[PDB]
Amino acid sequence: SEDAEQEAVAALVALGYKPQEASRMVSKIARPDASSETLIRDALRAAL
Amino acid sequence: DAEQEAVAALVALGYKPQEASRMVSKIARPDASSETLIRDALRAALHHHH
Amino acid sequence: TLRPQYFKEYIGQDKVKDQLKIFIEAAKLRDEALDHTLLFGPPGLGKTTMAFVIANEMGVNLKQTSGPAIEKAGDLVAILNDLEPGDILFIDEIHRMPMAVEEVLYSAMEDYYIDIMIGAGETSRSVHLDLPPFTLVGATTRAGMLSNPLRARFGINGHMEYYELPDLTEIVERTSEIFEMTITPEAALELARRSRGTPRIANRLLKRVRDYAQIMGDGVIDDKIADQALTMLDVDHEGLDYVDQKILRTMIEMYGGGPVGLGTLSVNIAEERETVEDMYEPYLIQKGFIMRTRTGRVATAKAYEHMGYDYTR
Amino acid sequence: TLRPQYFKEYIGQDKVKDQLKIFIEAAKLRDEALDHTLLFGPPGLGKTTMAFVIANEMGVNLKQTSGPAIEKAGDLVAILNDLEPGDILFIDEIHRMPMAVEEVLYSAMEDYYIDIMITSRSVHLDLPPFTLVGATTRAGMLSNPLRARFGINGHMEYYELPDLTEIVERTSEIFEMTITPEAALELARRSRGTPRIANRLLKRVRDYAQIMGDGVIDDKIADQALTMLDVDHEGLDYVDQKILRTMIEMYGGGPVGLGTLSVNIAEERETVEDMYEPYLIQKGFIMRTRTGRVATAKAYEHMGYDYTR
Amino acid sequence: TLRPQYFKEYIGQDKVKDQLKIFIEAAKLRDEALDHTLLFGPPGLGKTTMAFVIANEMGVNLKQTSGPAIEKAGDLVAILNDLEPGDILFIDEIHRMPMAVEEVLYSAMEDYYIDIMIGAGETSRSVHLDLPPFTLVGATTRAGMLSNPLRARFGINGHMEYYELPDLTEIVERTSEIFEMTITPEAALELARRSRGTPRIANRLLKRVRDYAQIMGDGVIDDKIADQALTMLDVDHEGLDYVDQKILRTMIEMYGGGPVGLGTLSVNIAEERETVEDMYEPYLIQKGFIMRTRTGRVATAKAYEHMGYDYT
Amino acid sequence: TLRPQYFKEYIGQDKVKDQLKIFIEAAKLRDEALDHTLLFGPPGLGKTTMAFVIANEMGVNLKQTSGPAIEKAGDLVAILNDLEPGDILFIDEIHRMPMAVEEVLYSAMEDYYIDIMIGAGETSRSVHLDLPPFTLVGATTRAGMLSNPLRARFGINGHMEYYELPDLTEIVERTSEIFEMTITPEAALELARRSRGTPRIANRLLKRVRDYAQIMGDGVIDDKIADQALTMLDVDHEGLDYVDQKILRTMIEMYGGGPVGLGTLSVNIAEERETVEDMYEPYLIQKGFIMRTRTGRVATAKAYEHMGYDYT
Amino acid sequence: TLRPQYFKEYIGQDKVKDQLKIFIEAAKLRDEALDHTLLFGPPGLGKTTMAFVIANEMGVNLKQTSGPAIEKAGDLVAILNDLEPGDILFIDEIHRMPMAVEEVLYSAMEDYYIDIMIGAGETSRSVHLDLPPFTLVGATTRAGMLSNPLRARFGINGHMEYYELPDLTEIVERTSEIFEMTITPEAALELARRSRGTPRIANRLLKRVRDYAQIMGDGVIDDKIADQALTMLDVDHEGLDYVDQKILRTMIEMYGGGPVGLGTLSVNIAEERETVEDMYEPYLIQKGFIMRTRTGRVATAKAYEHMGYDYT
Amino acid sequence: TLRPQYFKEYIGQDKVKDQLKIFIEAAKLRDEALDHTLLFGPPGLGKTTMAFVIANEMGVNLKQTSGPAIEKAGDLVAILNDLEPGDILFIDEIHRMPMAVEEVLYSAMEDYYIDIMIGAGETSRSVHLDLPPFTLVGATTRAGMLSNPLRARFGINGHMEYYELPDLTEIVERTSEIFEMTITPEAALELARRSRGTPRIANRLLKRVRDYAQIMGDGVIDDKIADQALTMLDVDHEGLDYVDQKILRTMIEMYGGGPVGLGTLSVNIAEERETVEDMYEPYLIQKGFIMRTRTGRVATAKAYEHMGYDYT
DNA sequence: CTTCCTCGAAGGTTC
DNA sequence: GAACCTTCGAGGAAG
Ligand SMILES: Nc1ncnc2c1ncn2[C@@H]1O[C@H](COP(=O)(O)OP(=O)(O)O)[C@@H](O)[C@H]1O
Ligand SMILES: [Mg+2]
Ligand SMILES: [Mg+2]
Ligand SMILES: [Mg+2]
């Protein structure tokens, strides 16, 4: 899952989030098994 | 010495010393010249797209 | 009504209202969202309410935000996930959005997806996120500074206009029913004539007349009370304040119509240059009473016949 | 105290004073707060004074700040959090607020709530009914959206000789100086229509009477004191009289340019245009023309010369 | 995509299209890169489309970027290093990049190499980097806006221009089939005449006319239907937009044709002065409706009769 | 010392000096601070010198600063609150203060309080800071540059005037005793009449004469040495410089007295238009040698009888 | 390469070459640098090329930049610190250099020193920089636009002029020999007559004609082919560009031949004033197409008989 | 070296040298610094050179800076802190300083102190800096731009005159002795008459003639080689350029001597209206070739014999 | 965003 | 009616 976890954190940074905040935002997500799309979708949704 | 030469060239192009060092430090080839290194340090940092 | 649910209730703006009705119905005959719409006009005419009515006609949920509130690409992308299929997104002051976000909106508007690029060199990759269909409704005052690529995505243009006397009269009538006061139809017309075609100014006059009618009268706004109230206030039958009348009189009486410089005119009426150039002068130009020339302001024939003075070329 | 406390003490301004009484009375009768009021006009006419009078008539405590003291949105957010129902907020020199602060302020005026971002964090506030009172000399410097939010506009005007005469007599009682009815009129004529100038002349005359007289202002001491200050019966200063004289005796009444006149009196160009001419033009002693400025018939009669058209 | 892929498909621009054919094929005979080319002209005429056609005819993969996308020499040098012999680089709005970048583009275009000078104080050295042969394509809205020494490097100029009625009718007719719309040869001509020479204006009008025909008619765009729809869209028979009609009407009724200054006119109609002079006056000047004088704008006799007012 | 310290030593300015004596004496009988005073007028007439005299006669400490030094409200807020009851604050070149800083004095001068923002974040507070009674004194050469609300707050206005020959003679004789030199009464009058009415110029001429008298003479100033020293400096008995004489001569011998334009005359004397209009022309007009008219400059009869020509 | 490298290869400019030979040769017997040289005249005549020739005759390195590229004084100081003794510095477009920057050259050219403020805060100090001997070469189109302080410091002035048919014809023959191409004498003469007397244009046209002759011809340039090729382009039978045609076609129709001001004309043709003022007006004036008048420019009879109008 | 070092070497300016000698000697006897002095006049007459002579005669370390180098008050304060007792501070182009900084010198020149704001901002206060005795020397080309309060503080004013042929001839000889070239008195007088009275121009012509005389001569500047060299430079025996010669001739050949207006003549010479008035007309009037009149300008008899026409 | 200043228009005199 | 001179007003660009 580290592959998708690293992708989701890196993609979220590309959206203008700081490297620190992106790592925390993704770490707050529960499901590890879901793909980066679901992880990035939930990260943005939870921060709204 | 070619590492500092490559870093010096990347500094002139506007890259900060930290990134130029990190960029050049990612590359390693004892026989490479500063010119062949420069042409790699940039090629290694540009996002290729298709 | 003041809070309209459908075009049948929205007062005025008949041109833009008639066009949107046909486009909405044509879109409904298909399982498609309405084309991206851009609204133009001076500030204060009601663009925000118009967007709300469009959503009710389509039978859709409306999301509301503004250009300044969006600072990074992630802000916009997060909002787009909140949309259900067919939702309407309203962005005010769209010309103030930073370019870093503007370039992301193009792909979303045209394809309904966003592609995010990450990595470098041999590690370069992209992730693709689908978006549900949506209609972007933009509103702006300064249409002339939008980039050409952005204007090319919008497919419908709507122009708002100042209200006319037959419609601005109805806003006064309807507003008079929110308070508890009776107003004669002949009096409602007198307030509309002086409201400069703007609903906000019509409300202000009604409030000031209301206070007078319940302290200097029997609590009813008849033509006799309106005449007195509009006499305590300086506003003339054309809507000119006291200071507006003093400017026109001075130009005709002391300079023979001009040309006269801004500085020379300011010291005669005892006002700051900024006050005459921004508060009073803009409306006199729209009304056609003065012109600005390389040598100074000049009064027009329309101004002479309104103040009641003889005119000669 | 020098500043009037109630409308019964506020002499003059019958137009603004009459309108404010109607709007204040109607608001009380409905138990509502007063609409937002903007006060503007020339210096020294009574703008700051009226702000305190409004509060005393409404029976509320006035919160006071100034434009130059507010530098960031966080400052205003702190101030507004202290307001209670019916409070009146007065901002002097409102034209100095930064553009980023104006956008916050005019939102609260319409919807009575604030929703702003301030390591960044959001701030949200719900505001009780309140009245904002602003005073400024440069109303045209305010943004068009903000000016539209104000419901009452008060434009101040210059005073008349009967009104200024009463002010001079009132202030004389605070200094407990005796002044005669005809002597008070001589200070009114020279006060250029402004209360602050009337108070200034009274102070300068009082200081003379305490040293060169018997400590009483009378028709004779006033004439001597005004001769020392060298203020003409029309209020013209020594330099103002020198301008008209030079125009009539060296250029036959004009036209003459601003540069030529300034160099001939040994005065700075910017001082003549911005400090001395404005009063001469409003009283009708000088005219501006496409080719220069000329002295009017009123100037000839006052200086004592034979007019020639 | 709607845009054509080859010169056989590309409608109009016969002059530019005929010249580029000769210059492209001549380069093949010599087996060398095509000379640097500059395309200029009004917006929306097909400049971006043409750039892809050139690459397809040459048989190369196009690379694309824009003026505001490049901000430092390292950006351009990186892009230039990632090139293959014969690659074509397209730069839109070439006139907007910073001059600090132009200093490097000169030697890249003319010398095919760059020499990065490096050193501090008394020290000074340089390293030269070879660049594979490439062809630069630039595009702008005005020719003179480009830097004078840079403009001298472009060896081929391509002046784009407005389409004529035959070419626009062929475009209008084609696009209608994509929407599965039935349009007669007469109706397609009315829309063409009123699109004022811009292909995307014609396409935008067609999409809007379709909606009206699907409700106020039987789904067939007839001459009788198109004329009613175009008056509903408030588009004049000369292609004057809503704002264009407002300008002329105000000059005639409120100022007797002028002269009038831009400040007065831009304040009477609620518009920004930067909008009137940039978006609308250019068309009214070329079409001869308004003329510029030191005293202000004036409405010509043609404008008077078109709007329908008794001339002096 | 070179600057007087009390009204007994301050020669001239009778009008301004008379007023200040009455107001200062009255303020002492009431035991209260003096009202705010603004001093303005031409350069070198005694504005700064009078500011020190006021403080010495009031018998209080003088705090000094200047307009160019203050740049932000924080600087002024630091000068304030350092004041003690009865202190005098003197600001020189007060016209340089930024407009955003002058608006801080509006409350201080009228009500002796200012509004300050204090604390941080949620603890931010607006608090009244209250000042003891004090007297502001300002000196400026450009009074018309101050905002109308500020000039209205000053309670005393002093406008300086040029000095007469009797007063300047006494000033020369006084200054001649600070240095160690003997000067004949008839020689001091000769320097005073050439000093254009300004004390600083009278001191400058004396300093230049001293250098000559001790190098080319016996160390004493007498009619014979003064005439020689004044011949080296080439200053006319009316104070006209070398270039001033050249202007009048050219106007009388080439243009017959005028009218002549400023440009035509400048080129004939090899000067430049800005030097003639700002350095030389002002004194010639104020002394009646030249008259400005719509057609050009004209030389008056007074100039003819001075240069020795015939007023034909 | 095309660009000449020695005076024996530089065609024309006989009046300038003769002077530069003597001064360069005299500067070689003595061991010193060449005096600062200013080159001015119409664009495209070969003044940049002349700078390379001078450097090659002197045998030193050449550094190149432009006025508009230098934004602040610190930029020029950094550049001057990068020159070795005897190097040549070439500055193009020097008339648009900012005033704040030009003020630095006055001391550098006369004495080779600069007064600069270095450091910040407490570290701020004045330093007296010293520069090695160097020769500045400046190029400008508007010699009369330079300030009197700068123009007086250049020691050599070179005026450059349009090339005549015997010179341009030789340049075409030379260029057509670097490429492996063959041109008949009649074709080279006609191609020069069409080239506005400007070498930059003659070289660009020759390349395009060569492409046409290779694909649409027999690989050899003949008068018949040159006439056809130049007719496929917009080059008129006497070199008028399409812009030249629009100017002449406008003056006669919109203004009845004039007189008309160049300012209003520029905005009516949608062109930048500088381009028409510096690149087009000089040629049309020196060739009798446009003539100057107090009220403005007027079209001559030669223009009417060229565009086919009647000189009524 | 080229620049003189002592009064014994400085030729001309007798009026200024005579005065400066007395004031320097008197200051030494008193053991005091020299009064502040302002040097002004036309360009190139020796102002910058004279400032160095004063320092050598006083015998002190000259500290140098420039007007445009001082960007803000912080810079000027740093410079003043470095002064030692008796140091001379020289500021060339003193008119280029900003007004906000010029007003800081007012206190430094009269009272030798500066009011400075110090402290972190939480705690801050004004303090008096006390400067040692020093001499300020200023040089400017246009004193009319300095504010009246600044010009009044300078105690010694020096106005530079143009040089006469006797004095200017000695400068040409002296300069040849440095170049080791032999020059005959007959030729030195020819160079002087063509130097327009300016030393900078005389030195420039001598350099160009020296180069020519050694490349195609015997190494002696004889009366014949000088004339040949000057013929190549195109300098008339009165110093007129070809542009000036065209003007004087045109007035005679097309207008019979005038009167003609400036706008009418400008067209006949293809010269910009303001250039002719600012650049060329001044010297022609000062030499007496042209005369201004109420109806235009007229060519005098002197201009007739210089061109050889028949005066009538 | 602001202060200075330069470029242009036109009124009036005279030949 | 061609040429000089003075005066005012609105932009724009350098802080
Ligand atoms: N058709 C209308 N009917 C009733 N009130 C209106 C109408 N149009 C505008 N208004 C009033 O005028 C104001 C419009 O504000 P808003 O809709 O925010 O303007 P915009 O969105 O154009 O900035 C509101 O006070 C609104 O009640
Ligand atoms: Mg107040
Ligand atoms: Mg002083
Ligand atoms: Mg010098």
Side-chain angles (χ1 to χ4, degrees), chain D residues 3 44 46-49 90 92-93 135 196, chain F residues 110 153:
Chain D
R3 292 196 194 280
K47 300 188 300 285
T48 298
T49 302
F90 171 55
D92 216 338
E93 322 307 339
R196 189 181 287 121
Chain F
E110 268 212 329
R153 284 170 163 70

Side-chain angles (χ1 to χ4, degrees), chain F residues 202-238:
Chain F
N203 288 339
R204 191 186 73 208
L205 289 174
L206 183 64
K207 287 175 180 177
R208 298 285 75 78
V209 169
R210 169 178 70 152
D211 293 334
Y212 185 101
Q214 76 177 120
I215 294 293
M216 298 267 94
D218 299 336
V220 169
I221 303 171
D222 70 75
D223 304 58
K224 196 166 186 281
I225 292 295
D227 282 352
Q228 285 186 9
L230 293 167
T231 301
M232 172 194 66
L233 294 171
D234 196 14
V235 179
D236 179 297
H237 80 285
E238 288 283 8

Side-chain angles (χ1 to χ4, degrees), chain F residues 3 47-49 92-93 200, chain H residues 110 153:
Chain F
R3 293 187 195 278
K47 299 189 300 279
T48 300
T49 302
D92 206 352
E93 290 88 40
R200 187 183 280 130
Chain H
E110 268 206 348
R153 282 172 163 69

